Amino acid sequence: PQITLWKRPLVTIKIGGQLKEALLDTGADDTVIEEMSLPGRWKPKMIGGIGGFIKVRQYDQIIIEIAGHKAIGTVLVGPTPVNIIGRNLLTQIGATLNF
Amino acid sequence: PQITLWKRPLVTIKIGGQLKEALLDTGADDTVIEEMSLPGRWKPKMIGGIGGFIKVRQYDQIIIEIAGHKAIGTVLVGPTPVNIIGRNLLTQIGATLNF
Numbered sequence: 001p002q003i004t005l006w007k008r009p010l011v012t013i014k015i016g017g018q019l020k021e022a023l024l025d026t027g028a029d030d031t032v033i034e035e036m037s038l039p040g041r042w043k044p045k046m047i048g049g050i051g052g053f054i055k056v057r058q059y060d061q062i063i064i065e066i067a068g069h070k071a072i073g074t075v076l077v078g079p080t081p082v083n084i085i086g087r088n089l090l091t092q093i094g095a096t097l098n099f
Numbered sequence: 100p101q102i103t104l105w106k107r108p109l110v111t112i113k114i115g116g117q118l119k120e121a122l123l124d125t126g127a128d129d130t131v132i133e134e135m136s137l138p139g140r141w142k143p144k145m146i147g148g149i150g151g152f153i154k155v156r157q158y159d160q161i162i163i164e165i166a167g168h169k170a171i172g173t174v175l176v177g178p179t180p181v182n183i184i185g186r187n188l189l190t191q192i193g194a195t196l197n198f
């Protein structure tokens with residue numbers, strides 16, 4: 001698709017068999033989702049954004065669909081205010097900015 | 100241009116007579132720049148994201164050049180860690196996300 005920016009670029013994702021709303025965010029290095037259960041071991045990470053930092057749990061090699069496009073990659077879980085799809089997964093789905 | 104997302108999508112902007120580097124950020128509603136002077140009236144605003152909120156100054160009707168493309172809109176000024184071009188100005192330069 002071609003997504004314009006007059007409104008927030010929200011899409012549906014699927015993760016853990018569940019549909020969720022998430023923001024396609026070219027300003028985010030990483031993908032971070034609100035609290036949920038994911039399989040496997042996690043590693044610690046801190047991420048730093050407009051307000052300061054939050055602590056999150058890093059899960060690797062997680063199956064995730066973004067607007068119907070399949071990806072498998074790193075998903076961070078923690079107290080983010082919205083679900084954010086960042087560049088690590090935007091690149092998997094072939095997204096570019098164009099003007 | 101077509102900008103890939105392998106690295107942060109940073110571009111040169113001209114604002115207030117100054118050259119700055121800034122991030123093309125589809126996750127940002129607003130545009131926020133590190134401390135600088137701008138003309139005209141302003142009012143205070145709080146903006147929030149990862150790590151919470153910061154206080155900024157809101158200037159309206161500010162001319163800007165983003166990667167060679169002119170526009171006008173509201174520009175926020177305050178203690179942002181990164182200069183951010185958000186959707187309010189990305190629309191005006193014709194930027195879309197494509198996949």
Ligand SMILES: COc1cccc2cc(C(=O)N[C@H](C(=O)N[C@@H](Cc3ccccc3)[C@H](O)C(=O)N3CSC(C)(C)[C@H]3C(=O)NCc3c(C)cccc3C)[C@H]3CCOC3)oc12
Binds near residue numbers: 126
């Ligand atoms: C101290 O922090 C940083 C320092 C130096 C470099 C980086 C790079 C990043 C980064 O990529 N941070 C991401 C991030 O929060 N990026 C955000 C932008 C940003 C980048 C660098 C520094 C600071 C912010 C995001 O693109 C956005 O706009 N978000 C994510 S949360 C959001 C959807 C609410 C929105 C927001 O903050 N909006 C606030 C906002 C802005 C920025 C402008 C105008 C109005 C508002 C409301 C997190 C999220 C997952 O990956 C890591 O942080 C950095």
